[PDB]
Swiss-Prot record, chain A:
<feature type="compositionally biased region" description="Polar residues">
    <location>
        <begin position="55"/>
        <end position="64"/>
    </location>
</feature>
<dbReference type="GO" id="GO:0039694">
    <property type="term" value="P:viral RNA genome replication"/>
</dbReference>
<keyword id="KW-1104">Inhibition of host RNA polymerase II by virus</keyword>
<dbReference type="GO" id="GO:0042025">
    <property type="term" value="C:host cell nucleus"/>
</dbReference>
<feature type="short sequence motif" description="Nuclear localization signal">
    <location>
        <begin position="186"/>
        <end position="196"/>
    </location>
</feature>
<dbReference type="GO" id="GO:0000166">
    <property type="term" value="F:nucleotide binding"/>
</dbReference>
<dbReference type="GO" id="GO:0039523">
    <property type="term" value="P:symbiont-mediated suppression of host mRNA transcription via inhibition of RNA polymerase II activity"/>
</dbReference>
<dbReference type="GO" id="GO:0006351">
    <property type="term" value="P:DNA-templated transcription"/>
</dbReference>
<comment type="similarity">
    <text>Belongs to the influenza viruses polymerase PB1 family.</text>
</comment>
UniProtKB/Swiss-Prot annotation, chain B:
<feature type="binding site">
    <location>
        <position position="41"/>
    </location>
    <ligand>
        <name>Mn(2+) 1</name>
    </ligand>
</feature>
<comment type="function">
    <text>Plays an essential role in viral RNA transcription and replication by forming the heterotrimeric polymerase complex together with PB1 and PB2 subunits. The complex transcribes viral mRNAs by using a unique mechanism called cap-snatching. It consists in the hijacking and cleavage of host capped pre-mRNAs. These short capped RNAs are then used as primers for viral mRNAs. The PB2 subunit is responsible for the binding of the 5' cap of cellular pre-mRNAs which are subsequently cleaved after 10-13 nucleotides by the PA subunit that carries the endonuclease activity.</text>
</comment>
<comment type="similarity">
    <text>Belongs to the influenza viruses PA family.</text>
</comment>
<comment type="subunit">
    <text>Influenza RNA polymerase is composed of three subunits: PB1, PB2 and PA. Interacts (via C-terminus) with PB1 (via N-terminus).</text>
</comment>
<protein>
    <recommendedName>
        <fullName>Polymerase acidic protein</fullName>
    </recommendedName>
</protein>
RNA sequence: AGUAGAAACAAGGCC
RNA sequence: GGCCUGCU
């Protein structure tokens, strides 16, 4: 017998045993080098789905740009980026008519948000490209550098603390005659003329995407600069506000709410239909979603949403698509060469691709360079006619929801009609009709309308079958959603934060999978045992009874011997495991409280210990000595950016002192626009005053503190 | 009219009034009268406080 | 040689 | 040979 797992589907319906076909147990494919081979391909393809568009030449950045909007209607099924503005506005207007007052309320909420938001919100972000070093720096570091340069160069309106003030600074910067920065290499002053700074503000940094499941070919993902971050934030806020009010938009909610919405839609469509009507669920998928959402359509949507709103709000919302329409996509790391005969290798920056000869490359990269060269300007390529990756998923989902709404049988004016649920890049459409040709006509109408709006259905990944069985972004549905457990498999291992955090996170993951993904009792117990085994093997915290020999075993054994109630030690200190199917919701240290020795209990959770980091998926945690934090890579030391570490040290010292002065700074972010020294001195003076008025402080101490504050103020004023 | 507000008042009063205006978000270039009013109120309160 | 797959590793920077 | 790095 030749065992054949796939033959199991002759009996088990595919949906039920669908977890078998998810190879999520092996290392995901990882990009092994430079993302400059995929970025050029993305640029070329984006310019190839819109070549019939209207070329032009931007008069500020001085780079060619493509304008496909209102282009010739597509004549073949191939992807087309020729969105029609009239059709987009019709979709939006019908969406507003079907949902009266959606845009007005969304604009009100966003006006409140934009008037209220602070500059600190830009720190809560992932890697961003900071335009002052031409590298990728964390969000906070990039924001700090940008604010430093703005203050140095005369822009200071962001000191008010509101985000919109920083945006005003950003806009006023682009008009500055010549910016200058003081980057190190002892430091030099590099001056950027108007055009250079403008091109650097609009530039996008592109890096290859890593750890992608379900694709054979690597993609490219881009991260926006720091000037475009705030406008994108406001636009995303508006789009989320709009989507939260749409029953057919699944993007702004979690998995379970997606399940609820999709089940509701299926029940509404299939059940309400009479016996004679047919039904058909299209589990489709859009192809080249990003390479066709032209930002000018986003500007049209933003202008139609913000009708009858204050001009300032309209402008601050519209600035984002205006900046994205002129974006330049920084190529990337640049290719690398080798010499088999001479036995050496060289690295060429991506900047010199415009000037380097084509005698080095392959037969494909040579064509890619030959085709991308016209668009290059100062080491970056114009990428006007498309997006790079998301950054507007909410608004794109709004567009998808509008096109889904456009077939409510009030706009179809025909027997057939459709609806469904839209999540950016993924849709499920449910057609109805009185005969099969009706379904055919409905599908054709939907496809053509989507093509007009500039979004293409993928015909090689979509099938239409009688309602019931269907799929949606990996939530398979067979007369009721079936839980596939292979998607959440990667979460079971030790997360890797620290000991207590790892224990809490693992037990919480097991509990959640028992709740949602229908993990059985016995399987939950085996997952618990395997997690404990992995956790012990990773943290060297074996049970103590064992004769394991490791770098940490000696004093784990010593502590085990010392203790009296050995059944109370934390699993991190070699204690027994006491979890089961009924204790998964109780944090470990709270679980063994009754069984703990007084001495060990006191030593364990001692605030004086130097390991707790004063805190930092929602995993229920308890402060304990096992909450230490891991080190950092320390790889900067070799580079020329050694001085940044001194900046970090000084900033931490100052912020710790401020924390000392203002107790609430740690809990709630400190607001205000008074310099730090002035705030500290004022607080000290008022504290001394109130203490002397009624308290411990006496006249001598009051005089000493007041004179110290006076000399501090004198030192400040110098 | 910035000369009037910059001259007729003390430097510290105008400085802290500038800080207040920046806090509230206004621009002194446009709402000069508000700047003068803020400076005048601050001077009034300071003269009220001092010498006691 | 080997891993690996549309580009890389098979050590790198400085004195 | 010595120093420094193992996501910069």
């Amino acid at each position: 017998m030749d065992v054949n797992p796939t033959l199991l589907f002759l009996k088990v319906p595919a949906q039920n045993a669908i977890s078998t076909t998810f190879p999520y147990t092996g290392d995901p494919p990882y990009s092994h080098g430079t993302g400059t081979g995929y970025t050029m391909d993305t640029v070329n393809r984006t310019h190839q789905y819109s070549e019939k568009g209207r070329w032009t030449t931007n008069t500020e950045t001085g780079a060619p740009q493509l304008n496909p909007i209102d282009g010739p209607l597509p004549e073949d099924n191939e992807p087309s980026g020729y969105a029609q503005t009239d059709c987009v506005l019709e979709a939006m207007a019908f969406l507003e008519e079907s949902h009266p007052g959606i845009f007005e309320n969304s604009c009100l909420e966003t006006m409140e948000v934009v008037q209220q938001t602070r500059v600190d919100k830009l720190t809560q972000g992932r890697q961003t490209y900071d335009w002052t070093l031409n590298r990728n720096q964390p969000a906070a570091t990039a924001l700090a550098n940008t604010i430093e340069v703005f203050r140095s160069n005369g822009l200071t309106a962001n000191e008010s603390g509101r985000l919109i003030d920083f945006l005003k600074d950003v806009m006023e910067s682009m008009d500055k005659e010549e910016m200058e920065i003081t980057t190190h290499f002892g430091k030099k002053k590099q001056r950027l003329n108007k055009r250079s700074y403008l091109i650097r503000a609009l530039t996008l940094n592109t890096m290859t995407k890593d750890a992608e499941r379900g694709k054979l070919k690597r993609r490219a993902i881009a991260t926006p600069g720091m000037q475009i971050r705030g406008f994108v934030y406001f636009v995303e806020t508006l789009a989320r506000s709009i989507c939260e009010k749409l029953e057919q938009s699944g993007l702004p909610v979690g998995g379970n709410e997606k399940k609820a919405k999709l089940a509701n839609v299926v029940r509404k469509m299939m059940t309400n239909s009479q016996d004679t009507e047919l039904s058909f669920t299209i589990t489709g998928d859009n192809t080249k979603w990003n390479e066709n959402q032209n930002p000018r359509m986003f500007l049209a949507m933003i202008t139609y949403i913000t009708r009858n709103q204050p001009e300032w709000f309209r402008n601050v919302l519209s600035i984002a698509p205006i900046m994205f329409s002129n974006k330049m996509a920084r190529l990337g790391k640049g290719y690398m060469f080798e010499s088999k005969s001479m036995k050496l290798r060289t690295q060429i920056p991506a900047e010199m691709l415009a000037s380097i000869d084509l005698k080095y490359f392959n037969d494909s990269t040579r064509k890619k360079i030959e085709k991308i060269r016209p668009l290059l300007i100062d080491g970056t390529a114009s990428l006007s006619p498309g997006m790079m990756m998301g950054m507007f998923n909410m608004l794109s989902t709004v567009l998808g929801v509008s096109i889904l709404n456009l077939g409510q049988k009030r706009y179809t004016k025909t027997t057939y009609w459709w609806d469904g649920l839209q999540s950016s890049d993924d849709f499920a459409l449910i057609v109805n009709a009185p005969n099969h040709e009706g379904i055919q006509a409905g599908v054709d109408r939907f496809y053509r309308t989507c093509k007009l709006l500039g979004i293409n259905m993928s015909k090689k990944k979509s099938y239409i079958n009688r309602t019931g069985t269907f799929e949606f972004t990996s939530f398979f549905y067979r007369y009721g959603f079936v839980a596939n457990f292979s998607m959440e498999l990667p979460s079971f291992g030790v997360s890797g934060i620290n000991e207590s955090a790892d224990m809490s996170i693992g037990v919480t993951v097991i509990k959640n999978n028992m709740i949602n993904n229908d993990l059985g009792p016995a399987t939950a117990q085996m997952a618990l045992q395997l997690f404990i085994k992995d956790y012990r093997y990773t943290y060297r915290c074996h049970r103590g009874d064992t004769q394991i020999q490791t770098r940490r075993s000696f004093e784990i054994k010593k502590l085990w011997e010392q203790t009296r109630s050995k059944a109370g030690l934390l699993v991190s200190d070699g204690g027994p495991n006491l979890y089961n199917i009924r204790n998964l919701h109780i944090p470990e240290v709270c679980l063994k409280w009754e069984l703990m020795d007084e001495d060990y209990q006191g030593r364990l959770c001692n605030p004086l210990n130097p390991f707790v980091s004063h805190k930092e998926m929602e995993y229920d945690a308890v402060a304990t000595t096992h909450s230490w934090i891991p080190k950092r890579n320390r790889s900067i030391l070799n580079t020329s950016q050694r001085g940044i570490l001194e900046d970090e040290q000084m900033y931490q010292k100052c912020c710790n002192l401020f924390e000392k002065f203002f107790p609430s700074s740690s809990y709630r972010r400190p607001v205000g626009i008074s310099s730090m020294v002035e705030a500290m001195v004022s607080r000290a003076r008022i504290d001394a005053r109130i203490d002397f008025e009624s308290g411990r402080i006496k006249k001598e101490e009051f005089a000493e503190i007041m004179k110290i504050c006076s000399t501090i103020e004198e030192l400040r004023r110098q | 009219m910035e000369d009037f507000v910059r001259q007729c008042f003390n430097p510290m009063i105008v400085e802290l009034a500038e800080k207040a205006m920046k806090e509230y978000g206004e621009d002194l270039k446009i709402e000069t009268n508000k700047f003068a009013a803020i400076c005048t109120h601050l001077e009034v309160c300071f003269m009220y406080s001092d010498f006691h």
